[PDB]
C-alpha cells in the first residue's frame, strides 16, 4: 500500500502541474489577446539540414504580426521559489556574520585560501615559449579560471583563432590557441560558448586587427 | 579598453536555439507575492558543493566595508 500511495502522490502533484499549466496558458491568452489573433500550428521544419542534434517540429506562434514563445509553467514557479530561498539564506548569513565577528573572519579567511588555491592551480599549467619568447597557458584550464572569475581582460584577434588573456593581478598577456579549444570542446559549445560566457560575466573584451 | 559587436562571426543556429530556450525557461515573468519553497537535501548539498551559496563579499555595502 506504499507504492500505490506514492503513485497517487505522483498523480496529485501531476494534476497540480496540469492545473498550473492550464491556468498559465489562460493567463497568457488573456494578457496577449490585446495584440492579435492566435495562429497555433506545427510548422514543418524548413531547414532539412539539422543533423547537429536539434529536436524536430518547431512550433511557430503568431499573435498577429508578432513573435511569442511558449514557456514552461511549473518550472518557472519552482525556480522563483528556489532563487527566493537562495536570496533569503544569503541575506540571513550576511546579517548573521554582521552580528558575530569571529565567524565572518573565518569565512573570509576561507575565501582567501580558496582563491589562493584556485589561482595556484590555474598557474600550475603555464609555461614560457622561448622560441617565440612569450608566455603560454593550457587552454584546457582557461574555462576553469573563468569559473573562479580569474580573468582580467580579453584581447581577441579577428577570425577568433587566438586569444590573449590577462590574469587578475598580473602583468602578463598569456597566449592561448582557440583552434585547439574548439578541437577539445566542440561537443561542449566550442569557442561560441566560450565567448558567450565572457559576454555573460560582463568581462572586458576587445577585438583587434593583427 | 572594452568593446563588443552586435553581429559577431560566430555560428548562427546556436544563438537562435540559446535565445529560444532562454525564452522558454525564463521569458520575462517575475513574481513577488510568493513564499519560497524548501529544496530537498540533494539540491541543498549540490548547492553547497558548487560554491554558489557564498555571501556576496564582493559588494562593499557592509560585508567588505569593515574588512
Amino acid at each position: 500500500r506504499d507504492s500505490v500511495d506514492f503513485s497517487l502522490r505522483i498523480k496529485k502533484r501531476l494534476e497540480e502541474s496540469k492545473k498550473l499549466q492550464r491556468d498559465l496558458q489562460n493567463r497568457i491568452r488573456k494578457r496577449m489577446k490585446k495584440f492579435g489573433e492566435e495562429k497555433l500550428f506545427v510548422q514543418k521544419t524548413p531547414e532539412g539540414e539539422a543533423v547537429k542534434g536539434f529536436p524536430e517540429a518547431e512550433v511557430k506562434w503568431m499573435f498577429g504580426e508578432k513573435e511569442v514563445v511558449v514557456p514552461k509553467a511549473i518550472q518557472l514557479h519552482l525556480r522563483h521559489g528556489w532563487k527566493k530561498w537562495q536570496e533569503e539564506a544569503k541575506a540571513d548569513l550576511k546579517q548573521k556574520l554582521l552580528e558575530d565577528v569571529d565567524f565572518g573572519k573565518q569565512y573570509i579567511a576561507q575565501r582567501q585560501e580558496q582563491v589562493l588555491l584556485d589561482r595556484d592551480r590555474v598557474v600550475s599549467k603555464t609555461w614560457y615559449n622561448e622560441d617565440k619568447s612569450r608566455w603560454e597557458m593550457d587552454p584546457m584550464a582557461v574555462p576553469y579560471a573563468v569559473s573562479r572569475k580569474l580573468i582580467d581582460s580579453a584581447r581577441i584577434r579577428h577570425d577568433y583563432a587566438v586569444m590573449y588573456v590577462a590574469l587578475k593581478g598580473d602583468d602578463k598577456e598569456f597566449y592561448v590557441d582557440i583552434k585547439e579549444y574548439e578541437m577539445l570542446f566542440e561537443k561542449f559549445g566550442g569557442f561560441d560558448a566560450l565567448y558567450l560566457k565572457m559576454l555573460a560575466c560582463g568581462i572586458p573584451t576587445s577585438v583587434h586587427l593583427m | 579598453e572594452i568593446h563588443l559587436k552586435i553581429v559577431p562571426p560566430l555560428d548562427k543556429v546556436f544563438l537562435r536555439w540559446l535565445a529560444r530556450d532562454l525564452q522558454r525557461v525564463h521569458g520575462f515573468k517575475p513574481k513577488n507575492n510568493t513564499r519560497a519553497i524548501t529544496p530537498p537535501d540533494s539540491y541543498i548539498e549540490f548547492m553547497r558543493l558548487n560554491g554558489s551559496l557564498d555571501v556576496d563579499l564582493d559588494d562593499p555595502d557592509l560585508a567588505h566595508l569593515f574588512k
Binding site: 582567501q112 589562493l116 598557474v123 600550475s124 603555464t126 609555461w127 582580467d152 593581478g169 | -
Partner: peptide, 18 residues
C-alpha cells in the same frame, strides 16, 4: 575588484621553465 586586490596581496612564485 576584491579578488584583484586579494591576488595583489598574495602574489606567488612558480618557475615552470619550458
Amino acid at each position: 575588484x576584491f579578488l584583484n586586490n586579494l591576488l595583489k596581496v598574495m602574489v606567488x612564485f612558480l618557475x615552470x621553465x619550458x
